[PDB]
């Protein structure tokens, strides 16, 4: 997995690859790794795919209920607190490494939460197997006062570095751009550099090639 | 250790040490063996001696093979012991008692190896 967050001059952009692996096998070639916690708070998770999906779904439920209770736009800090307190309660058994980014009435935010409940603030972050490859690009090219376009290019370029250089990362680049004044735009499959090529032959079997013992009609 | 080539070719092609070993045999007590249709008879010639314990000429190598000899008596014990060990080793390794042909090839092989090894006569 490769995940990066890049805070720029008016918001924050998080990007991720779309490959999911079960050991050396690619179970899902187009997994969506960017998850909503609220409309303008988004989370990207590495490590165990189920826990990252499940933990964000639980916190996303509580954020919505708390937002309805307080009649306020959710704070990214509320998601961080409930998310880290939940992870800490389980003493790291929930192997969810997460980059939570979003915009709230108090500005744009970018945090990373580790499976044990530790958090850090940052202007650019990375998680997953491709973190070192992605962080090499972020270190080289990140600068203060990035524009939205520079940040999206930097975030995608950082993910590509993990895609090309990490075996656990590949396929496509997912990008979500959260800017302070406007809605969050989820650019699903922003870049698709790994489209498979045409097969050399067509493997359409002639009908009747398979031997059948009995045939039945199933009632619904 | 000692590895001098005692057995070597004479200028006329003769290995004298081997020929002189034949002279030792011709000086030893005579043994005779004749085989008939159903049995082999081994006879021997003896040169205050105790017949009970003085070693006999015909020595069993196994329950079915007997080895008579002539020449240096002390050397015979070395061949016979080697033959006996090989006969028991053959059974232990192949479960079949040695054939008389097999035993003769081993004993002959041992005698030959001593005409081409260093430091042995």
């Amino acid at each position: 997995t490769t995940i990066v967050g890049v805070k720029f001059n008016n918001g924050v952009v998080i990007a991720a690859d779309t490959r999911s692996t079960q050991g050396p096998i690619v179970a899902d070639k187009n997994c969506a790794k960017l998850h909503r916690i609220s409309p303008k708070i988004w989370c990207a998770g590495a490590g165990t795919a189920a826990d990252t999906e499940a933990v964000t779904q639980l916190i996303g439920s509580n954020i919505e209920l708390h937002s309805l209770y307080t009649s306020r736009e959710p704070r990214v800090v509320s998601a961080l607190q409930m998310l880290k307190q939940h992870l800490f309660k389980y003493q790291g058994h929930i192997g969810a490494y997460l980059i939570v980014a979003g915009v709230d009435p108090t500005g744009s935010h970018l945090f990373s939460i580790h499976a044990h409940g530790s958090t850090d603030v940052g202007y650019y972050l990375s998680l997953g197997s491709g973190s070192l490859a992605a962080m090499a690009v972020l270190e080289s090219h990140w600068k203060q006062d990035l524009t939205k376009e520079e940040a999206i290019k930097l975030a995608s370029d950082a993910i590509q570095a993990g895609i090309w250089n990490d075996l656990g990362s590949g396929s496509n680049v997912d990008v979500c751009v959260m800017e302070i004044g406007k809605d969050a735009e989820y650019l699903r499959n922003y870049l698709t550099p790994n489209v498979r090529e045409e097969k050399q032959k067509s493997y359409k079997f002639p009908r009747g090639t398979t031997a059948v013992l009995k045939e039945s009609i199933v009632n619904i | 250790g000692y590895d001098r080539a005692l057995s070597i070719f004479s200028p006329d092609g003769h290995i004298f040490q081997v020929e002189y070993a034949l002279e030792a045999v011709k000086r030893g007590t005579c043994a005779v063996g004749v085989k008939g249709k159903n049995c082999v008879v081994l006879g021997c010639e003896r040169r205050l001696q105790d017949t009970r314990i003085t070693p006999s000429k015909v020595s069993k190598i196994d329950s079915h093979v007997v080895l008579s000899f002539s020449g240096l008596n002390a050397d015979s014990r070395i061949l016979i012991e080697k033959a006996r060990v090989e006969a028991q080793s053959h059974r232990l390794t192949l479960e079949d008692p040695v054939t008389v042909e097999y035993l003769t090839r081993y004993v002959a092989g041992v005698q030959q190896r001593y005409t081409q090894s260093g430091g042995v006569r």
Binding site: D28, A49, S202, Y203, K204, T210, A211, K214, I217 | -
Partner: protein
Amino acid sequence: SDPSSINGGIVVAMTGKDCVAIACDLRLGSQSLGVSNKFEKIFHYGHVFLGITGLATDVTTLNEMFRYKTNLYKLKEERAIEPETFTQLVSSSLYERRFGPYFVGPVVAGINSKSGKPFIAGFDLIGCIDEAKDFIVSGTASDQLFGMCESLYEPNLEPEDLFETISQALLNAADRDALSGWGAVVYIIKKDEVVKRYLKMRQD
């Protein structure tokens, strides 16, 4: 040692042109020993089919659980559970026991009765929704099926052509897996009817 490999078995789901296919092997065993050649691993809860592989005790337990849950769902809702909704019901149920997990990999397959579009989804033993537009594999021979399905599968296969592709992927993957085989069953799921077929295959 590994609970998911004790009993063997494999399940594969494929999508076609307004049709879904889900197939499985019929072997149940105790490691090397093959016990039953009639242990079906595909269950249906209306128009939604669930193929569960893994530990045979957990496969049976989850069938009665999802029958219990889907039966109550249709009484309260007065309508059958759709494949997309059922996929989340399976996902949550498997996660509810993150620390006591079932050693099973389920495969959801069906056609949404309202939108009419094919649907197939995959899972881990703790409920990661692996929704795929092309095919889903599970079981001991997932390695064989992935390469076998990845090469044979092509988009928009007709129900007759989909049967040949999924059956051939299953038989050839099962033939190369020790713990899978002893016959296979293929369901061809269409918006209007479902056809269940038993395949002839090696019995060793």
